[model samples]
Target: AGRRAACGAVLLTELLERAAFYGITSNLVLFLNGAPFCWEGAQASEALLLFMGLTYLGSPFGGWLADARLGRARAILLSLALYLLGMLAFPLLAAPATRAALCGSARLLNCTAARCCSPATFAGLVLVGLGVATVKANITPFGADQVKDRGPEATRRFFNWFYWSINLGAILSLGGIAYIQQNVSFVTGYAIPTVCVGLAFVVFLCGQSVFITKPPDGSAFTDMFKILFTEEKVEDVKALVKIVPVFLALIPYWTVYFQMQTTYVLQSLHLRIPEISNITTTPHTLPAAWLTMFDAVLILLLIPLKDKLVDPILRRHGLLPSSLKRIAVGMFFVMCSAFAAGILESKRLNLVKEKTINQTIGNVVYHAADLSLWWQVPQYLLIGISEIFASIAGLEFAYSAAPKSMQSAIMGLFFFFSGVGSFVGSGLLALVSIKAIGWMSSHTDFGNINGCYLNYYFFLLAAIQGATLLLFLIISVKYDHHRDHQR
Candidate 1:
């Protein structure tokens, strides 16, 4: 086993995990809101936010553990074990007898019953979070440690490739696993991804001989805390302080970015999409999760284009974006994507108000809008473009900017902000539902007004992000990249 083989194993594990994780996340809201549990939209969104938020919240701890307690390989192995157990356990918790009790009353929501029945699911989600944190916290740096090149360009290229590898799994899950979940059965859907994760574990084990593990010293976080006791901060500690504001700026961008999974996918369910469109025959129905794949597919296509065309051109002009600049541009796009989404949502609301809806036909409780689903393409498209500029650059910046010893800790800190953004999104929804929020007055009378207030939410997202972009510009202008790079 060589560095090449080690990299292969690492990427393979990432691919399988990504597929299983997104496979569940992309459609989990639907599962909760639509059938089986049939919880309300708020209930479903709450479940998802709690799951994903904790997942990212666990990142900093994972990073600290990898860097300070167990080494990288050991930490990641622990994570995989936790993830695998969670996957196997969730389905068993949602047993056949329990489903009947869950749906027993007209409200169909037994608080204690809900917890008793799927306590395994919640427990599994936390385990999944821990597992994900370990991999995400340590995997890229661990993989990079195997390669000889650590130059600026090479490091940048590696993170880009790492992100690309992630989307590859996302494409598979969004299409394949989601289709099975929609067309076949939920148990089958859950079972297959667990099996894929099992395959991942086997592949991870096979390449063990080749893996280059990083052993822990005293924790960087411990040193980080120790520094605060002194009168002065070290250069890296100062860099971290400066970076905190930058990290805070990104939370709003993530707020809009993460909605693609929750709000956007949920919105798709209300649209009528065809499984098969033919010249002579009526189109068959398709799952809402099917539309989520476009974001992944676009990401796959755009990454190469950005690498081959956009970056080189920028390099020729000496215009490769700095961390702040890259993310600032992404903030602009975040606002832009939301603006487009706001319009589409407005159109959807108008359509709902103007027409009478059938509401349900067989298993599909959500009625689709008469307008074409293709209208959503641009909103998803912008997010993909922003990801190329912002998301990849943020990860690369965190790695490059940190002191070498504190690399994983800083990276974990960065990942934690994503969870903050998820919490903010969830909070935004709750806040908007309040009568005093006023903007949502049209949509929040609580009867389904086609989620008319979604436009209001997106518009709010746009304005906040627009402000964040300006603040980022002001802050970045004062930040000396020279100090960060010297490390």
Candidate 2:
């Protein structure tokens, strides 16, 4: 019965997270529609902040409710229901007018030259984002409840499977949604996610008989605030302090990581890939939406490979650094990806400039040489690999270090770290804008459209991330996972 309950918990949690992911991913698509009009950074950064903040808020609240009165089972059910409602509402709310208005507002705020968003679409996207916060916070921790008492190896196995399942579900959504967008109406494309959410709820209800049914422990709620704020539990306090810096340091990597959705896509679109080419291409045009799937696709391929090839090799050779070590290594990869992207961006600029000069000279009607879109693929693949190392390892490491009784709270903390990262990214972007724009304006009289400052911004992120990698390495060298033994 316990095993069944645990499995049910994990399965339901997976379903919920996937549903939540659909909503988040869809919102990202919507933002992509408005990006040209909005402030480049705000288009991606604002939604991320809102989503992360809400996740942070919801996590503690959900944890409290579960510990206080609703218990885990009831909290899970309620969370699922709320998430389903949120997903169902997204498409309905995102009307054409709404999209135009929001895109317009984004343009106004970001000082962009285009008009891309509508009010209705903006409102609808916010609703979808809110829904993401509600569902993502509760479901992830609930999944960890599945193997909470199975000891270290079992716990690690559960997390590996958890991440694997998440990537699989992501792949399904990525592929399915892309198909729907191509073959059906955009509205219909979103409806598929709504339907998926409904199905997920039904499946959870079906598995209820197998779920653990512990009554809520109200005492835990009474002590929650004290536990987080007070220093009575010396070890918990020490652990919390140790982890805080690590969380702060990781923000730059996430800032870079999330560019896969924003700057990376923009860069890809600008690439002048062939509409029909000699290299066996009917049309080499890549859709922005399709590129989003690289992370999931890589995960799908690498999860098992990591276990079979990477993990075994690491274990045999004693190369498996501590979780922090893996994360630091991952950060290095992220920096490398950024630097590579910077190089590509420079090349693209040169191509664009050459094309412009040739057109001015009437050498060609169009600058066809400016279309090397495939150059961005290397950076995308590198980002994918970095995610495999940093994100997956961080998730497992964070969970392992958390006290068993505080699993939900600890997992919530993980989500909270993501929120912090988003906030930090936004701040860094602001700083870059100020410095980059000032430098560009002083040295060259170029407007936003013609300016090459964005390339500099990418380089700035690379440098910051490189520094963060070193800092994380220094801290992680002394960071021990004492919770491993406790488990």
Candidate 3:
């Protein structure tokens, strides 16, 4: 098969996988905090953090596995299998019979029954995380390997388009599946993704012929150890060292980025759903998870505009920022997004104090405010713009800076930093939860929304991002962009 077709297969695989993965992640907090599970906000958020953190943290190991043992395509297939098996847990465990079985003679699902199911769900989550991390570590490098002969510009454009496709899948799941998960049956909700992932597995396996499979060389991990102990590849190690600060500075950016999934969703559940006045007999209530789609939709539009219209004009004027500068610009946007979120949260808090109501969905309750959800639109837009600049640029920087042999390893390392960011976000939550701090304190066992100092928390994120941006700009100046092209 031609290289073009090979890239097509890889992109197709990515689209399906993205849809399935996000289908679960987009609605995970809602699932955890409702009905059978009925976990608290902090508990749900921590579970999300752990899922995200370990998934990314395991990427480096997956990268090594792909490079040292399983070839990229094989590693990808194995990951898909594990992912499909993991997805099965939701459908299987959420099934009526299983719930009935767990409930024993009573046949009504209660806390005791939920406890029985929790460990199995966690087991499934472990499999899902491992599968995702492995796929992430190998897939991009596998795709990039196909187009290596096409030169750097083609590769750069590929990264942009790749991100675009990723968001397209996100939009599908967030716009469609998330609605189903919340408004429809959880079993059906979970089943759709399980099927989607199953399709992804089949598609990737079918594409084996078109794929440019790279055989595993000696372990990239072993090579790293060798370089550290002996001085054979001193320059490769030096090149890696230069990029460390670039990765380190991005931890704060990731801290801000992850909020889109966790705190952003939690915050949305507390706001009044945007409604049309009189089109129908009753007012329309928008789903809280639906708001997350705005970010993905904007990303879908912006990636092309920047790639085609904006980048060309900037290049013509000698204004195109280097990868580092592009990343730094993105960081500034993240700070702005966080500041904007903080402002919105403050406004929502005021409205909450003025008028509020408790909404019970299944076993869980949400403390909603009189404020419209539209206030959230601006922050989503800002974060979308930030991603176009920061996230895409960061991926390009990782791929471009690495030595040929270590491309996948570096990509894994890059994602590993994001894992660190997730852990840091979790750590921040832990810190604020202390009795002396009490930022996340609640009036009741379930935690009242009015008690949450979310505005202050968002402002803290803004401050952290602002500081990181300054650090990144300095580091970017000293970075060896001049050398990146030659390599």
Candidate 4:
């Protein structure tokens, strides 16, 4: 009775969790850049990247703990508790008024004192990071555990539906939550997501009685260590080690893909927004974050097409590409997106130089190029396409290839590399922000948008990803492909 219900329940929980997670991340840099914190371009960019890096990096520990000690069920429950607490704390603690009250004179943006940002708020972020990491590391593996049949067909279908659920959450957060945060109060914006997460916790907690639960006996880490320390070469250890190159090669794809959150969003702020007065009763402009919804919506539309239509035909024809091939295809897509972004940025910058359209509000000097908000859609669409090929395929490979006991651990490894990519991106941005090696600024006093060279940065990523893709192809050619599907 519970098995059938459990799948739906877990899907719903993941949906809610993703919606809440994106609500925070989609607008985080903007939040820190604006109002009370008033972070510089470099400061805000680095902050967002570091936070994401930390979040992804925590996955191995989450995966290890889930597999080795607490089990998937209890690990998820703990993650929810941490998530709910952080969700509640962040809105209250990060409020501008709250920070002012706590620090008094020191709370103002220009204060040079150490720890100008709220320590309380940053603590809340730590809780949120750990919470997200644990949930991400465990949730999909937990959902797969509920399946009646663990065949490739069933598992593939489950992951598609699972990813579909996540993007639905992405749609709500990027489309609706983002709009509210920009137009309405951040308090209301954060509270809505908090409520979503709260409901998710209750949903999963109530479903526990009927769920098929696995008890943790020992860690995958322990097995790995024992294999390494002992003289004998075990198949399991060899199997795990074989996949390391795949994960390593993926760092560049993640680095380029993650720009959708940071540089890509920042790029949107300088572009002209179209009014949607005809669609709504009152005149309204779309949020820059709303542009990101295309990525989610495209995934929502494309997933079923790929699963039900394209993949079936390909499989019938003996042409289902190896996961590595699919991943290489994904890398190419993201590389193209970055190149497209570069071209767009170049045009926008030229318009700025022409002095064709410029505006300043208060201390903030900005420019709205003649380019339409829709200009950014192609890059987002490209990123979405890459996600389906690279991200989904990566997940399938991670789950299918690894030993059964270490499924969570392998998935965790997948995410950990993604975190490394974020850090690499952070480092690159940090380097760019330096005056000696200047190409861009995340934001600056002189003029945020017009002063920096985003086109150069975009081009830089394109080349990096292109090189990485070539490397991936070389690696894929030599890799033992049959072993990936044997387990």
Candidate 5:
């Protein structure tokens, strides 16, 4: 049974991890293609909002299915199958015209009319979003159920390891698959993930013997809603209320952290960087995908340190605070990361403005700036550390705080917060851009440079995050983690 459970847990983790791998890689490729098709900044933000919102609409249904008729295992299997089918169908749906638009000024690839977008293209993307909703909603709670028999301490440890393994798998997927995409062919890269999901399904099926079979208890869902609206349990309501501020505080962290996929890469691509010394070190630029690997690398390195080194010392000295405190401290690190990015952006903008002015005077035709891309490494590493602290710790925190019968529901709630955060991120971008444009145009010719004042935007985000962090600290001091322990 133990072996079966472990197998189920690992397989579930792999499936979820592969799903994230597929989503992120596909999104990256799509963004690279789509970013130029839409207007920059606000339009790009809107596109992401639409994608995330549509994907989010599936989570509640996924939860209902898991809670109602489909058991966790079956739900996961269904989701994985759909996800695999979606991935397989994605490339075929790319219309020739859209492909041509994606290729843009690049002379390498042939962009025929049928390669980019059509009815099939729209259907394919919708399928991708459906797959995401299914996979994300089921796999996490299903993995948690695999260890249901374990005591709370054991369960906490399992979840910590679970999150660590997640990062490891994601890192491998992003790094390995990205390398394959660059070195071999995009078709091979896309095909590998499909194969992985198949392997994960096989592994899961083989390990079904050990899974804890929970009868679909409809009462827990009813009880949660009652507690939420009808009944006024002060402590339960307070605990739920406390989670709101923490949720709000983490939004800016995600906003900045996600930039590793967006503006962070743009900065790196535009800056000078040394070559990776693998076979040739001829000062070649690093791929943006490679930077994504840093978060995983840091998590892989820190997990053992956190488990063996940090936790032990804290316990030995009786210095470890509650999980909420740990999370708050983690927010501090995330704030630092935002501030670091702000500083880097400020410097980069200064350099860009100087170059722009120099070009206008015909001093030197396109002066090669001396700033190294490696300077961004510290900020990336800092963000990774913050993720290690907040993400893993918060998983354990949420799981522990949830009532035993409502574990899956609570996990779903946690993911719901992520969707909310993404929405908030999109809203903030819209609000700031609208407010800043008029003021910015009057002060400087920002419009002439095509939204080159992104550095100022980063600074504003830093301030917002700093303020959120302060609020989180204040609210956390009054928060209680043991409120739901009785359940």
Candidate 6:
């Protein structure tokens, strides 16, 4: 129970905390758009992306704090406490009794909901973001720390399993808890996360006696700056240079992956598909958001298969799937998924020409497409598979590639890439505003996509992936990940 005890506690913390955190995040925008807060377009626009960007931006700082001041355990504990406050308090922002007191006579009817609620909500978001960043920076290191005596292979294996915990939590949150939140009550939704997080805190505290704590070796920032300025540090600088491109290459993949959240879901709805309610009435009808659960489910299935079956066989044939190689393969799958999505986009565009809705044409709602919702199956499946290679590999690679001093910091930077990806995706969306690209139409525009080619968007993303994959393949060919050589 030594390493197992510490890592297990860490895993538990991740599971419950992720469930709580993601459940709140996955639907937070919806709540802001429609609920007691009732946010405007600008407010709602910033809710998801801005909040997420800021959250990751905090990661490097969190990593620094873990390196310089707080140890991993203490930092994670602080994060848990902050999450407790954030999750619990934000829900209260919607509470009948709490809203009146918090807003204080700026009646909901008089001022904008934004005016009344912004102060508390924004503060809550900031708190949660900070907590999440601190946890992100320290958590992976914490797991790896527990396994040092078990050796490098064990540490490597630990990450994939760690990723599983994350997916497991997300599955619980999005699929299970969100469904309840949608059909049942927000109180239950919120309470479930809160309770889980609180238990995580307790479980983590109980493992304190067992954790073989690793003191911070060095600072990522300090180490990086030294590489830049120190004349003797040539190879370190070279390593840094090699890694930077890897960081840049993954950004487009993130934008494409995240698109599933808003863009893909909206497009799916616009396509001709069975009314979910019509397919199975009463309690059986599922929301579009529920489809995300499929990715998580596939991850659950794939991790074991990859570790047990695929990986060993590849090794026996003298084809060892290095982290970068796995990522390149994942990028290929990303392109494939994008291509599949494009087919849907093309069909939807053609259907737009007809513009007739509520009409059934060969089991498809003619205004949307000629296929059922299930036609989206391949894209979703590809995305799930790609994650097995790309997403999981990236997380492991970041920690593995960085110098010992900078592992947490590098991991934090990896988190930042996702923030940058969000920003990049926002910039791409601005093309719609120019109108020359003809890529986006407002939701109210009916079935008339007006020459918008979401298929083009997917194709563009696919091409980007293909280019990055090629560049990555060329660069990674001579790359040497040699840190474990010390032991």
TM-score of 4: 0.85
Q: TM-score of each candidate?
A: 0.84, 0.75, 0.86, 0.85, 0.77, 0.87
lDDT per model, in order? 0.72, 0.59, 0.76, 0.77, 0.58, 0.71
TM-score of 1: 0.84
Given candidate 6, what's the lDDT at residue 263? 61
The residue ranges of model 5 lying beyond 4 angstroms of the native Cα positions read 1-12, 23-49, 91-117, 148-150, 223-261, 277-286, 353-368, 435-451, 481-487
Runs in model 6 lying further than 4 Å from the true structure: 105-114, 217-242, 260-262, 271-285, 352-367, 443-451, 481-487
| C-alpha positional error of residue 149 in candidate 5 after TM-score superposition, expressed in Å | 4.4
lDDT tens per residue, model 2, 1-487: 3486557556555754674465455445343444234435445555555655665556655655655667666776677676666665445534454444333433243444523433443554455454455445555555655566676555555666677777777767766664454434666666677777777777767766665456665654344343324544455545666676676666666666664345565455455544434321222222334545556776777778877778768868878546777787788888888888888777766666656322111111223335555777678677767777788788777777764445556666667667666666656555544653642232211112234445676787788788878877876755654435531
Candidate 6 lDDT, 1-487, residue by residue in tens = 4456778888888898888877777667656765556676567767766678768789988877777677767878888898788877656765666767766643344324334467788887888888888888888887777886776557667877888899999888888787766666666666787788789889888987888776765443454454215453455555666688778877876766665445666566565555445443454445445655667888898888877887678768867457778888888898888888887778767766766355332122324555566777788789878887788778778877776655676778888887788677767666553656656644321133435667877787777778767877776664644333432
Give the distance in Å from residue 65's predicted Cα in candidate 1 to where it truly belongs. 0.5
Candidate 5 TM-score, true structure as reference: 0.77
lDDT of 3 by residue, 1-487 (tens): 2577778788888888888888877778767755566666767766776787668988988887777788878989998999999888877766776754543322334434324457766888888988899888888888777787777767777788889989998888877787677666778889999988998888888889877777777744455543225554566666787788878878877876775446776787787663434421132234455656767888999989989988888778877446778887788888898898889998888887777976543234577897777788898888888888888888878888886667777889999999888777767766876788767666422346578888887888889888888988877767754465543
For model 1, residues 70-95, the per-residue Cα lDDT tens digits are 87778777778888888876454344
RMSD of each: 4.6, 6.9, 3.8, 4.1, 6.3, 4.3
RMSD (CA, angstroms), candidate 5:
6.3
Give the per-residue lDDT digits (tens) of candidate 4, residues 192-283: 88999899999999888767888885834555554214433266787777788888888877777775447776777677765565532233
CA lDDT for candidate 3: 0.76
